[PDB]
Design a protein around this ligand. Structure first.
Ligand code: BEF
Lengths: 208, 328, 49, 49
RNA sequence: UACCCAUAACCAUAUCUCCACAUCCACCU
C-alpha cells in the first residue's frame, strides 16, 4: 500500500513488483481518497485474514501517513501539542495492531515506513506513540544514509521482541551470544566488518 | 572527544550526543590520577625501614628483625589471648614462630597410621604414656589419649570425658574451665581448649588450644594500629618517663614524641599502612616511541605492571583455592 | 677473555643440548649454536668501556 | 639539542647570587615566566608581541 | 484548549614532535 507519494515511483514499483499487489495513493489525490482506499484495504485484509489468510501489508510512510491523516483530521478536539484528533490514530492504531499472529492459521504481517527526525513535533510524537505499539523497530540514521550506504540501518536501536518464540533455543541462544558480542561494535564499522564476514557464507551457513 | 557531536563552542558544555567528554587538553592526563585496590594490606616502606622505625617505635616491636620477619616471613603476633602455657607464661604481644604457633593453635597433635584388619591393643579413649606398648611393636611418645579407628591411631595431649546425657557444648566450640560441657553441671570444662563430641563412644574430648589470634604481615600490623589508642599510651609514657632515671626515659621520650606527634597532628596511625596504592598520571611516566615502533618507557610503568600482575595473581589464587604455603 | 667467556656459555649450552638429546648423529647442528659467542664478542667490541 | 640549542643551566649558585642581590622579580620571572609556567610563558610571549 | 493561550532546537578559539638514560672522550674553573 502506497500513500502520499510521487506517481513516477508508483509506476516504477508497479512495473518492478513482478505482479505483487501494489496499491498507491499519490499526494496529488485528495486525502479523502487516501483515507477511503486505505480503510478499504484495511477491511478487505481483515476479511481475508478472518478467512485464515496469510497477508503481507507493506504500508508507505506510516508517520507521514499520520501526517496525511491529520490532513484529513480537522478538529483535533482539545488541541494536542501538534494538532491531532483524540480518535485520529485509533484508525491507524486499529489498522496497525490488527496485524497479529493467530494459532488458527493465516497471519497478518504489516511492515510500514516511518518518517522521523523531521524537525516538527507531530512526527516525533507519532514516532513515540507507534514506537510502543510495534513489536519490531528499524531505525535508519541520516548520517548512514548520507554516505550512500544502504541498508542504512541504525543497528543498535533496531530489534524485536520475544526472539525465543520466533527463533529456536539454539537460534535464540546463539544470537544471545551474538548480540553479547556485536553490541560493542560501532555502527558503520560493524557494517563493513560484518558485511565482509557474512559475504563468506549464508546466514545459516555462517552458523553452520 | 571519541565521536565529536557536541563539541563546539556554542554547546561544548552540553553533554555530548554519542559521547560524554568535556572539552579539555591532554593536561588532564598530566593531573588525573589512578589507584589500585590491593586485596591485601601493605605498609609504606618508609615507615618500616627508616632508621627510627615509625612502626617499630609506635609499637613495642624490634625494627631490625621482628618487624620485617612478621611483616615478610611467616611469623604470628597476637593481642587478645596468650594465657595458654607452653612452659612459658601468658602472652600479650609476644612474637612466636609459626611452627610452635601452629602447634598450639590446634592442641598437641600426632597421628599414626594403623594396619587395617589388625585390632590394636589401644582402645578409643585410652590414656597413653611414653613407652607403653600399644601393639606387638608400636610405642607412643608422650602422655595423652590415643584414639582408635578400625585403621588409625591419634595421639592427642587432650583430656577425654565420658558422659551419658545430652550435650551442652557441641563440636567446634572452644571452652574455658568451669563452663558446662555436657550433662549439665555433671561435666564442666577444666582447661582452655576446644570441644569435640563423639557419640560413637558418647564422649567429649577437650583439647588444650583456646581461640587465639593468628595473623601474618601487614594485616596484623593494621589490626595492631586499629586497636591502638594514643591517649592511654601517652599517659603511660608520661609516667614511665617521669619516675625512672635517664637511660630508660631516653627511649620513653623518643617514642613519646612520636605518639604526641600522631595525637596532636590529626591523622591517626591506622592508615599509616596503605590499602589502596595511588597510580601516577600517565604523562609523568609516558611511553614514547623512539624509532622503528619501539617504545622507550619510564621504569615506573614497569613497576606498576609488575604490581598489577602480582595483585591479579593474588586475586585469582585467593578466589580459586588456598594452599596455605603457596598463599603465604 | 671475552672470547673464552662466550665459549664457556656455548659449552653450557651444548651440555644442555646433549642432556635432552637422544640419538648421537647430531654433531654439527644439534650441538653448537653461534648466538652466545658471537653476541658476546659483538657486545665486547661495541659496548665495552 | 639537534633541533634547537636548548637553554642554559641556571643551577643554584647562579640562583644564590641572584638572590644575594636584592633581585626579587628577576628570579621570579626566570624561574616561572621564562622556564616553566606554560600558561605564563605563552601569555608573556603574546603580550611582548 | 483553538485567536491569547503552545515554543525550544542548528555553526566560529592553537606553541608542539622528538629529545630518556647509560657509557666514553674532551673543554672551562
Ligand atoms: F507502550 Be509500551 F510498549 F508499554
Amino acid at each position: 500500500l502506497l500513500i502520499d507519494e510521487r506517481p513516477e515511483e508508483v509506476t516504477d514499483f508497479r512495473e518492478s513488483v513482478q505482479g505483487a499487489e501494489v496499491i498507491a495513493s499519490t499526494f496529488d489525490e485528495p486525502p479523502q481518497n487516501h483515507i477511503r482506499v486505505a480503510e478499504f484495504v484495511h477491511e478487505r485484509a481483515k476479511r481475508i485474514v478472518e478467512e485464515g489468510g496469510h497477508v503481507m501489508i507493506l504500508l508507505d510512510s506510516i508517520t507521514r501517513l499520520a501526517r496525511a491523516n491529520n490532513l484529513v483530521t480537522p478538529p483535533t478536539g482539545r488541541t494536542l501539542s501538534g494538532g491531532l484528533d483524540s480518535a485520529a490514530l485509533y484508525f491507524p492504531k486499529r489498522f496497525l495492531g490488527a496485524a497479529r499472529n493467530i494459532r488458527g492459521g493465516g497471519s497478518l504481517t504489516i511492515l510500514a515506513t516511518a518518517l522521523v527526525e523531521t524537525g516538527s513535533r507531530m512526527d516525533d510524537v507519532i514516532f513515540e506513540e507507534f514506537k510502543g505499539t510495534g513489536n519490531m523497530e528499524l531505525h535508519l540514521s541520516r548520517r548512514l544514509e548520507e554516505r550512500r550506504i544502504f541498508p542504512a540501518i541504525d543497528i543498535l536501536k533496531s530489534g524485536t521482541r520475544r526472539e525465543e518464540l520466533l527463533l529456536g533455543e539454539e537460534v535464540t541462544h546463539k544470537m544471545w551470544l551474538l548480540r553479547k558480542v556485536l553490541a560493542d561494535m560501532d555502527p558503520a564499522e560493524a557494517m563493513e566488518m560484518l558485511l565482509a564476514r557474512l559475504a563468506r557464507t549464508k546466514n545459516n551457513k555462517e552458523f553452520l | 572527544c571519541a565521536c565529536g557531536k557536541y563539541k563546539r563552542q556554542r554547546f561544548e558544555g552540553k553533554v555530548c550526543e554519542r559521547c560524554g567528554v568535556e572539552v579539555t587538553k591532554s593536561i588532564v592526563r598530566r593531573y588525573r590520577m589512578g589507584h589500585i585496590e590491593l586485596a591485601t594490606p601493605a605498609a609504606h616502606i618508609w615507615f618500616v625501614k627508616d632508621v627510627p622505625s615509625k612502626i617499630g617505635t609506635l609499637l613495642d616491636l624490634s625494627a631490625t628483625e621482628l618487624e620485617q620477619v612478621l611483616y615478610f616471613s611467616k611469623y604470628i603476633v597476637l593481642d587478645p589471648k596468650g594465657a595458654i602455657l607452653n612452659g612459658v607464661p601468658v602472652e600479650k604481644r609476644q612474637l612466636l614462630t609459626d611452627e610452635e604457633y601452629r602447634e598450639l593453635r590446634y592442641g598437641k597433635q600426632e597421628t599414626y597410621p594403623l594396619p587395617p584388619g589388625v585390632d590394636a591393643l589401644v582402645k578409643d579413649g585410652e590414656e597413653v604414656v611414653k613407652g607403653q606398648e600399644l601393639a606387638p611393636g608400636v610405642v607412643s611418645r608422650l602422655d595423652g589419649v590415643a584414639l582408635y579407628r578400625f585403621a588409625s591411631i591419634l595421639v592427642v595431649k587432650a583430656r577425654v570425658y565420658p558422659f551419658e546425657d545430652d550435650v551442652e557444648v557441641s563440636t567446634g566450640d572452644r571452652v574455658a574451665p568451669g563452663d558446662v560441657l555436657a550433662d549439665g553441671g555433671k561435666v564442666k570444662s577444666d582447661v582452655y581448649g576446644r570441644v569435640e563430641v563423639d557419640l560413637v563412644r558418647n564422649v567429649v574430648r577437650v583439647v588444650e588450644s583456646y581461640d587465639i589470634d593468628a595473623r601474618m604481615g601487614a594485616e596484623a600490623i593494621q589490626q595492631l594500629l586499629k586497636e591502638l589508642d594514643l591517649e592511654a599510651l601517652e599517659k603511660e609514657l608520661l609516667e614511665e618517663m617521669k619516675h625512672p632515671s635517664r637511660a630508660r626515659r631516653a627511649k620513653a621520650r623518643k617514642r613519646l614524641e612520636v605518639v604526641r606527634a600522631f595525637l596532636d597532628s590529626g591523622n591517626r596511625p591506622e592508615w599509616m599502612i596503605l590499602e589502596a596504592v595511588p597510580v601516577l598520571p600517565p604523562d609523568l611516566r609516558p611511553m614514547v616511541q623512539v624509532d622503528g615502533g619501539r617504545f622507550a618507557t619510564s621504569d615506573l610503568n614497569d613497576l606498576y605492571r609488575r604490581l598489577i600482575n602480582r595483585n591479579n595473581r593474588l586475586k585469582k589464587l585467593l578466589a580459586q583455592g588456598a594452599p596455605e604455603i603457596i598463599i603465604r | 677473555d671475552q672470547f673464552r667467556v662466550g665459549l664457556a656459555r656455548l659449552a653450557r649450552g651444548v651440555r644442555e643440548r646433549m642432556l635432552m638429546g637422544s640419538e648421537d648423529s647430531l654433531t654439527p647442528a644439534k650441538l653448537v649454536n653461534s648466538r652466545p659467542l658471537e653476541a658476546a664478542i659483538r657486545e665486547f667490541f661495541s659496548r665495552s668501556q | 639539542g639537534k633541533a634547537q640549542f636548548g637553554g642554559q643551566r641556571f643551577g643554584e649558585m647562579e640562583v644564590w647570587a641572584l638572590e644575594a642581590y636584592g633581585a626579587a622579580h628577576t628570579l621570579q620571572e626566570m624561574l616561572t615566566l621564562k622556564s616553566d609556567d606554560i600558561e605564563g610563558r605563552n601569555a608573556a610571549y603574546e603580550a611582548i608581541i
